[PDB]
């Protein structure tokens, strides 16, 4: 479904590990009282 | 390997590719068990 | 000359002096061990690795 690959940050340790890859759950929750249309299924298929 | 599955999806929706193989493969010898045990990766046995 | 055994100040800065391959002028005893690496573990985990071993 999906697949990503982050680095991190600067640093002087190339094998301490860091937490890059949380870039994969970054979503912006400023207008977040209503819901989007385009998650429900039966929009999308609607549009389609 | 991770990274190797990123590489092969994005070449195949590019439409590069229908099919890729895709993995990874290391091997063990004398020289990387002892360069890992200087930087103190590895489990020290005696220790164990 | 007299005698006298080695002092545990000479020999704590020689130890840090060569692991960081510096002469002894160029690193203060007055920095810390954390200061003097920079951002390195693994020279850091080295240098308490030797002092645990020497004294
Ligand atoms: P530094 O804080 O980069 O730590 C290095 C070590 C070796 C401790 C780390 O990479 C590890 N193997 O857990």
Redesign the interface.
């Known amino acids: 479904a999906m697949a990503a690959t982050a680095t991190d940050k600067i ?3 190339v ?2 590990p860091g937490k890059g890859i949380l870039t994969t759950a970054r979503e912006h929750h400023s207008s977040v009282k209503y819901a989007s249309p385009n998650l429900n299924m039966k929009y999308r298929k609607r549009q389609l | 390997s991770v990274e190797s599955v990123d590489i092969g999806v994005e070449t195949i929706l590019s439409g590069k590719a229908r099919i890729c193989i895709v993995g990874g493969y290391d091997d063990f010898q004398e020289e990387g068990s002892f360069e890992f045990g200087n ?2 990766a590895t489990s020290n046995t005696l220790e164990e | 000359i007299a005698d006298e055994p080695v002092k545990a100040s000479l020999l704590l800065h020689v130890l840090v002096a060569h692991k960081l391959k510096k002469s002894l002028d160029s690193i203060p005893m007055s920095k810390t061990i954390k200061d003097l690496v ?5 020279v850091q ?1 080295e240098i308490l690795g030797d002092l645990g071993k020497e004294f």
């Open positions: 640093g002087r340790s094998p301490a | 930087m103190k | 920079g951002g390195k573990s693994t985990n």
